[PDB]
């Protein structure tokens, strides 16, 4: 979970925790991410393709 | 480590009022010390211990809880009455005594509500009630003592009581016959006479022989005299007859107290 | 030099002390084994108590 | 589950008569409650517990059984005297207390006869005796307490008693010196002084220190003060000397009570 | 088998003298019975139990040892005071009660000196002291009870005591606050309130509820009411605050008695 | 219900020192050790060996690394 590099370094120090080695290990965790890329770029192409644009809708019908 | 807590104030403590001791869910209640003043134990009627709205144990009056403790020779103090969920008299057979005693503690884990309801008599001088809890780590309700009340007519001669509830898988620790004219009693299961027609003096001698105190106008049939839970009556789903033969000298209505035991179930006894 | 810093543990639970307590429970059973046999009693008969004795203590 | 039975009527209960309590073979007798009236415990002489015609325990008079129970601080009631086969004071070392106590129960399995003989004094006013049995599942006689009687002359000065029976494999729970002028006693085995020359006041203090009651005109040497059976004297076949050094102040006849212990054998002690 | 020995004569027993009970090394001391006369327990000051010159337990006066025994309801006799190393009230959780009690015995194996020092007051009428030892097979000092003395000033209002020694790995069986004006006390560790602000009457009720005797002018915080050693306070290193909140009504100096526990070490507490 | 723990016979070794020796053969043996002491008595080197042997109550030792 905590990665091999963080585990091996922390495992070497059998006990105790001081200096930057302790602070980094104490407040350690995994990571995620979020950013704009393929989804937003594809949606912009749909807007560019719909220029000057045509009306499309739903709600009417026999119901 | 145990925790001793001063329970929250009991709401609306007044004469003729219906109060309740709502216990916070999460931990285990080994003992609950109830302090009272301006009211007698007999003035605290219909004491009911409820788990999730269901009845666990019932006491006609708080005085019955005082007598319950007196019987086991537990410490009795005026102005205070304790609810001993953990049975101090328990002795282990294949486990330690401590484990056998604590196994009766009132665990609340998984519970939605834990209450101790009761009614304050109208004649109460100036009722004042507070509670203290001796708790420990949380556990499921599990094994609990279920005190049940039954009223039956006794004759002057011989009366037989065979309609006592027999919840499957449960056990019977003891049976207390509250009557003033009981001479001797006999207990049998499926014809087998586990307790011969023992005279009161003889039955009471055996009780005292095991450190128990004889209660006035009561014939106690202790199935756990040694403190061994395995000596109690196991309500086998195969028992055909659970009978009690009472030899009385008076024609009265007896209050039969039955101390049941079993793993508490949301849809059980 | 050695030292500990920052730990986590289960609540109200038995620790390494209870691992020692079992050892004290085991040594009681060892004494009880000697108690059952008369040969165990005779082994204890060669025990004198006096004010002086040999002491030894060192790291290794 | 235990069974409490009203033993069959004791045949021919009268002054100067020799009666017996014949116990039905098959189950285990934990306790036997003997109710008496119209006669004193001292008027019930030569009480003998016999298994298959052989002597197990002996009491000069029923009063010695009352004193035996009093010493352990067991419940004493006038008009009743119990035979405690199961030793309630027992404490387990590698087993539960319950197992250590019940281990002394009088099992009858494999037995041909189980009797409790005694003689009713001629002076008995109007002897009336009945018995109740607290039984449990059948077991072999097995581990039993064997109370033995011995009479020895005690001098004013120092007396030594080294001729006490030493049945191999058996144990000694306690030794009771019944004399009015015993100041101090010393107990040793093979030169080893297990009990220094302890003054009566000092010995009696240790006894009381363990919840025991000091008997009048008696010097008790309790080898099971903690309730641990493995603290008792193990009569090893190699023991060369089992001696008692009594410091008396009177010239009298002492009744030495020795509580032996061992697995009952049809051809043993 | 245990051995009861009449300890060697105590050297120079006289008023104003500083005597010592030097115990022979080799075996285990379960109990030490100290007989006294011509002097009061309060006249036997500064009682110290030393192992290898290091202090184990301390008593301001011999009267504190009498009160220590009285609290547990141990046998008390005038003219004699015992040192109970083996704790008779102990109950086993994963071991037998006997093992849990004997584990506190004073083993001397590996020791160089075992002493019980004390000072005889000058006012002593005609001091006379002797000792008897109840010993068993030799064992290391191992698990021992370490009675420590502390003096703190109390105000009239609230007083907080958080500077109590917290030896790592050790435990706290109980804390005794010796003061005449203590109304209520609260105990907490790291903010956690293990003992709510309990009124004296309520605290004393729980104590008696467990077979303990309430001592005069003392507020006892028993962490081993059930006899379970694992209910005691475990002085874990990560503990940041061990606090005591005392609500007094008087401005006095209290004697705080702390019963520590742990494996005896040549270089430990 | 319960599960019982084992009760058994462990490592207990009773070593009875059965000493059997002929009284007359001992009397000679005790007489032989007297001759050995006499051999030490004749020489001054025997006297000097015994001067290095006193008696004490006990010993002691302490260290750290
Ligand atoms: Ca439970
Ligand atoms: Ca038996
Ligand atoms: Ca110890």
mmCIF file of N, CA, C and O and ligand atoms in Angstrom, chain C residues 24, chain E residues 28 85 102-107 139-145 262, ligand 3:
data_model
loop_
_atom_site.group_PDB
_atom_site.id
_atom_site.type_symbol
_atom_site.label_atom_id
_atom_site.label_comp_id
_atom_site.label_asym_id
_atom_site.label_seq_id
_atom_site.Cartn_x
_atom_site.Cartn_y
_atom_site.Cartn_z
ATOM 1 N N UNK C 24 3.851 -16.738 33.845
ATOM 2 C CA UNK C 24 3.651 -16.904 35.288
ATOM 3 C C UNK C 24 2.613 -17.991 35.573
ATOM 4 O O UNK C 24 2.707 -18.696 36.577
ATOM 5 N N UNK E 28 10.481 -18.998 48.616
ATOM 6 C CA UNK E 28 9.439 -18.013 48.350
ATOM 7 C C UNK E 28 8.642 -17.715 49.615
ATOM 8 O O UNK E 28 8.205 -18.629 50.311
ATOM 9 N N UNK E 85 2.008 -11.246 50.792
ATOM 10 C CA UNK E 85 2.641 -11.078 49.492
ATOM 11 C C UNK E 85 1.741 -11.736 48.459
ATOM 12 O O UNK E 85 1.432 -11.152 47.421
ATOM 13 N N UNK E 102 -0.876 -16.688 43.962
ATOM 14 C CA UNK E 102 0.493 -17.064 44.301
ATOM 15 C C UNK E 102 1.532 -16.304 43.481
ATOM 16 O O UNK E 102 2.697 -16.220 43.865
ATOM 17 N N UNK E 103 1.110 -15.754 42.349
ATOM 18 C CA UNK E 103 2.023 -15.014 41.488
ATOM 19 C C UNK E 103 2.589 -13.777 42.171
ATOM 20 O O UNK E 103 3.602 -13.229 41.737
ATOM 21 N N UNK E 104 1.936 -13.341 43.243
ATOM 22 C CA UNK E 104 2.388 -12.165 43.980
ATOM 23 C C UNK E 104 3.334 -12.518 45.123
ATOM 24 O O UNK E 104 3.853 -11.633 45.799
ATOM 25 N N UNK E 105 3.554 -13.812 45.335
ATOM 26 C CA UNK E 105 4.438 -14.277 46.398
ATOM 27 C C UNK E 105 5.838 -13.684 46.263
ATOM 28 O O UNK E 105 6.314 -13.426 45.157
ATOM 29 N N UNK E 106 6.499 -13.480 47.396
ATOM 30 C CA UNK E 106 7.840 -12.911 47.405
ATOM 31 C C UNK E 106 8.936 -13.949 47.172
ATOM 32 O O UNK E 106 9.492 -14.502 48.120
ATOM 33 N N UNK E 107 9.253 -14.196 45.903
ATOM 34 C CA UNK E 107 10.312 -15.133 45.553
ATOM 35 C C UNK E 107 11.638 -14.449 45.863
ATOM 36 O O UNK E 107 11.749 -13.228 45.754
ATOM 37 N N UNK E 139 11.338 -19.072 43.933
ATOM 38 C CA UNK E 139 11.019 -18.471 42.642
ATOM 39 C C UNK E 139 11.686 -17.102 42.616
ATOM 40 O O UNK E 139 12.059 -16.574 43.664
ATOM 41 N N UNK E 140 11.839 -16.528 41.427
ATOM 42 C CA UNK E 140 12.429 -15.202 41.312
ATOM 43 C C UNK E 140 11.434 -14.221 41.921
ATOM 44 O O UNK E 140 10.265 -14.561 42.102
ATOM 45 N N UNK E 141 11.896 -13.020 42.258
ATOM 46 C CA UNK E 141 11.015 -12.009 42.829
ATOM 47 C C UNK E 141 9.789 -11.852 41.933
ATOM 48 O O UNK E 141 8.653 -11.867 42.407
ATOM 49 N N UNK E 142 10.031 -11.764 40.629
ATOM 50 C CA UNK E 142 8.962 -11.672 39.641
ATOM 51 C C UNK E 142 7.898 -10.626 39.961
ATOM 52 O O UNK E 142 8.202 -9.560 40.494
ATOM 53 N N UNK E 143 6.654 -10.937 39.601
ATOM 54 C CA UNK E 143 5.530 -10.030 39.818
ATOM 55 C C UNK E 143 5.316 -9.710 41.293
ATOM 56 O O UNK E 143 5.000 -10.594 42.092
ATOM 57 N N UNK E 144 5.470 -8.439 41.647
ATOM 58 C CA UNK E 144 5.326 -8.018 43.035
ATOM 59 C C UNK E 144 4.469 -6.766 43.178
ATOM 60 O O UNK E 144 4.336 -5.973 42.245
ATOM 61 N N UNK E 145 3.914 -6.583 44.373
ATOM 62 C CA UNK E 145 3.125 -5.396 44.685
ATOM 63 C C UNK E 145 4.089 -4.369 45.264
ATOM 64 O O UNK E 145 4.858 -4.678 46.175
ATOM 65 N N UNK E 262 4.304 -4.953 39.008
ATOM 66 C CA UNK E 262 5.189 -5.193 37.879
ATOM 67 C C UNK E 262 6.242 -6.232 38.220
ATOM 68 O O UNK E 262 6.407 -6.606 39.378
HETATM 69 CA CA1 LIG G 3 6.113 -12.866 42.555
#
